[PDB]
Amino acid sequence: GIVEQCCASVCSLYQLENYCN
Amino acid sequence: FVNQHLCGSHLVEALYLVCGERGFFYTPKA
């Protein structure tokens, strides 16, 4: 989920943009 | 500013800033 990807490990702009509408 | 560990409200604020007017979805339990 985003928490695994961005909090437990380092986030990226690619991952963030994947949750934008 | 997004290439770090972003958790909780810090994550939601990065989403709010990067996504803009497009908005986003925050699903913490995946």
Ligand code: NA
């Ligand atoms: Na990561």
